[PDB]
Amino acid sequence: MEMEKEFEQIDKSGSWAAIYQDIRHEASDFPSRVAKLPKNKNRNRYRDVSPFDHSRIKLHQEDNDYINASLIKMEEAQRSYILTQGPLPNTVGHFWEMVWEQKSRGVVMLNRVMEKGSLKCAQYWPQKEEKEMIFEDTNLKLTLISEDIKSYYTVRQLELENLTTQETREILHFHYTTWPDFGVPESPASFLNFLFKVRESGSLSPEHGPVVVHCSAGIGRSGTFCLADTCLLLMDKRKDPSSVDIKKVLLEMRKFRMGLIQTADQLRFSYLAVIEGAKFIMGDSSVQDQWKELSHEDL
Numbered sequence: 001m002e003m004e005k006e007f008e009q010i011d012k013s014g015s016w017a018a019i020y021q022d023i024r025h026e027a028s029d030f031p032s033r034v035a036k037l038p039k040n041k042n043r044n045r046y047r048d049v050s051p052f053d054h055s056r057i058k059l060h061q062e063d064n065d066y067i068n069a070s071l072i073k074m075e076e077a078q079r080s081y082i083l084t085q086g087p088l089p090n091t092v093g094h095f096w097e098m099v100w101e102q103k104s105r106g107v108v109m110l111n112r113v114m115e116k117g118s119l120k121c122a123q124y125w126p127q128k129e130e131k132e133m134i135f136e137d138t139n140l141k142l143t144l145i146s147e148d149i150k151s152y153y154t155v156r157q158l159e160l161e162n163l164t165t166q167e168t169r170e171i172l173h174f175h176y177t178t179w180p181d182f183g184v185p186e187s188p189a190s191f192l193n194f195l196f197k198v199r200e201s202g203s204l205s206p207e208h209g210p211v212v213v214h215c216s217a218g219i220g221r222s223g224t225f226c227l228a229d230t231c232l233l234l235m236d237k238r239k240d241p242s243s244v245d246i247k248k249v250l251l252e253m254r255k256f257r258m259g260l261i262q263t264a265d266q267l268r269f270s271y272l273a274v275i276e277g278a279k280f281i282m283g284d285s286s287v288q289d290q291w292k293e294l295s296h297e298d299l
Ligand SMILES: Cc1ccc(Sc2ncccc2C(=O)O)cc1
Pocket: 145, 157, 158, 159, 160, 168, 169, 170, 171
């Protein structure tokens, strides 16, 4: 079926939980043996969220090459993403090692450091220009260059230096700051405006390594971001945009990391985002300005 009318048909029939459970039943199951080795227990935030062996990102280190991160490679859309958990106190150095080794330009963060009164990830970037961070275990230095705070998100320019070779690179940090502690946003307008800002930066483009995207576990909000981006790109590439099947795309992405999209509410929100985003793309270029306005990002 098409998307927008399949959407109204699930709303009127109130069957989002059943649709989502079907996806869970059909999703791939691949081994994650490296994640479960005892030496890696303090490298995993959640015991039930692990990268598959076949798609996990390897650190270029001979002692322990493990990080909780997966390469999602979308062949028809010609986009790749790295999805990872929020860094832990003992993995912030591994996190920036991965960014360096994979030649990423951008990092997309979809959570706040504290949510629901508990820590959801480490403070892994510097908050003041004059107070840089040094990661001694991986020999990297990280400096805040500039920060632009908007109403729904913040963009930061960061400098990452490999202290071994004295090479430097500019990394862009895209921080969506307004996802609610419970549930999903009422309108997808600010999330879509954010996605378009990441796109406009070059961070998703083939001349760079894959974008690194995370939330707390790296499967829920993170899955919503890459699912919406890939579906919109396929609608632009194909002769028949109504042939894009969001459930089939999600199952393809779940071949590369378990658990993407964590609730039926996140599934419904992903449909909403793709539906509204397809109107702004067209050919309606003006819709982009509309999203920006409706997002009230200023202040
Ligand atoms: C490796 C790297 C190089 C350059 C930059 S940007 C910059 N650096 C210093 C002053 C100003 C800027 C600016 O972009 O205005 C970031 C990272």
